[PDB]
Design a protein around this ligand. Structure first.
Ligand SMILES: [Zn+2]
Lengths: 157, 105, 53, 47, 48
DNA sequence: TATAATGGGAGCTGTCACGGATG
DNA sequence: CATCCGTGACACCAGG
């Protein structure tokens, strides 16, 4: 509920690609290789893996075991993925303790968590790069600027 | 957050999966009944659904029997996810609408 | 505000960030109509006595 | 008297909040929809 | 035997002597109600 | 209203997260 | 782009 980076944080892929393991007797790394890109994820030697070598992993798919950083999942895979993840992970606890509870309420709260956005390009507006505001307000401003024919604001969730 | 209107007219929705990947990474197995019920019961269908010879119309409030029917359909391989109105996708300002929220449980 | 807007076009990320942080306060004072100096007190108010009996 | 209870008015603790904020050099202003000030103190504190 | 009917309890019941105390939490000290009453100085709210 | 006097003195013992400062 | 640090916050009623 606080959207905190977990202590036992799982490592997720920033892009798509194929798995290439490279494990020396003393160190370990995982490489996701695209058609023309390659990402290196140097992780400690004793971390559990979820990726069989030479597999195709989605962006934001977990490589290591553990809890996913919701902000990393947001950057990698987008808002729908984070909403799915938060709702399911909270429900896991509640089902484990034997508590029946409707996704409706958790979704309400998550909706309030996804309430704001961050400007990446002000366009023709008075806003600033990095300024935080509400999704509703930036969408209203962008609709008014598209009506005026101006460049809308580029915003990130 | 209050129910402030009857319908925000959104065309967006979420898809409640009826299957989850096995921890063996072997296949997809059916979710537990209670989980599907907590995901679907009392909700409004965002799209037409035709399973086991029954028409579940858009705008229908899924009763518990509708949920058991959808579970039966998924068991017979006719459906893998249910499109549904949800507060995640409601566009009512300062709250949600009636269709997106669904039942008063 | 103009100096900070000029600073907002800098290649450095931290300088852009600090210019934004200053410009948000500047624009708060501008859009509100409050003089910055009012953050300094000349006449300290006194609460009504019945509220501190 | 056997009469139905009246519609309420401003609770005193909100007036206490407003005055304790004024004591912090903060002007709290109850406004109407025209953004014109509304006097919750009924003129008893305006010179 | 059920004292209201004279019929027996359908099963045999555990009966015996037990040591039971009366704790200090008696309702005579706790029942309380108020229509109106004293109010606080600054807040003008009911006392507690 | 006058000798001279010229720099204090406690403190007493969380746990975490977050945002800002520094280094 | 890290570590360090100062400052927040830490359930309800009851009686006290
Ligand atoms: Zn809606």
């Amino acid at each position: 509920f606080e959207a905190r980076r977990p202590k036992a944080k799982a490592v997720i892929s920033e892009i798509d690609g194929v798995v290439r393991i490279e494990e020396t007797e003393e160190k370990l790394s995982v490489f996701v290789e695209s058609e023309g890109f390659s990402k290196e994820y140097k992780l400690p030697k004793e971390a559990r893996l979820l990726v069989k070598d030479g597999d195709y992993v989605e962006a934001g798919q977990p490589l290591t075991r553990g809890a996913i950083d919701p902000h990393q999942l947001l950057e990698a895979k987008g808002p729908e993925a984070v909403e799915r993840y938060l709702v399911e992970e909270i429900q896991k606890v509640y089902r484990a303790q034997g508590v029946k509870l409707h996704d409706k309420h958790i979704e309400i709260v998550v909706r309030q968590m996804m309430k704001y956005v961050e400007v990446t390009d002000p366009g023709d507006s008075r806003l600033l790069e990095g300024q935080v505001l509400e999704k509703w307000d930036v969408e209203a401003l962008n609709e008014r600027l598209i009506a005026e024919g101006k460049t809308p604001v580029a915003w990130k969730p | 957050i209050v129910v402030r209107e009857a319908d925000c007219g959104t065309t967006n929705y979420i898809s409640v999966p009826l299957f989850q990947p096995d921890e063996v990474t072997r296949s997809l197995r059916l979710r537990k009944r209670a989980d599907i019920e907590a995901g679907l019961y009392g909700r409004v269908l965002a799209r037409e659904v035709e399973v086991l010879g029954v028409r579940l119309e858009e705008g229908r409030y899924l009763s518990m029997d509708d949920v058991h029917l959808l579970i039966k359909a998924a068991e017979a391989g006719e459906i893998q996810e249910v499109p549904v109105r949800s507060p995640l996708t409601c566009q009512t300002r300062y709250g949600v609408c009636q269709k997106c929220y669904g039942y008063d449980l | 505000e103009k100096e900070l807007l000029e600073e907002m076009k800098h290649p450095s990320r931290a300088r852009r960030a600090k210019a934004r942080k200053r410009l948000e306060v500047v624009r708060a004072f501008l859009d509100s109509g409050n003089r910055p100096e009012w953050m300094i007190l000349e006449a300290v108010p006194v609460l009504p006595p019945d509220l501190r009996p | 008297k056997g009469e139905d209870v009246p519609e309420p008015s401003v609770p005193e603790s909100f007036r206490v909040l407003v005055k304790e904020l004024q004591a912090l050099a903060l002007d709290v202003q109850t406004l109407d929809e025209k953004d014109n000030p509304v006097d919750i103190f009924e003129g008893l504190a305006s010179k | 035997y059920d004292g209201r009917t004279g019929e027996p309890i359908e099963g045999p019941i555990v009966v015996g002597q037990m040591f039971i105390m009366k704790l200090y939490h008696m309702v005579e000290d706790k029942m309380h109600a108020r229509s109106t009453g004293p109010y606080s100085l600054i807040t003008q709210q009911p006392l507690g």
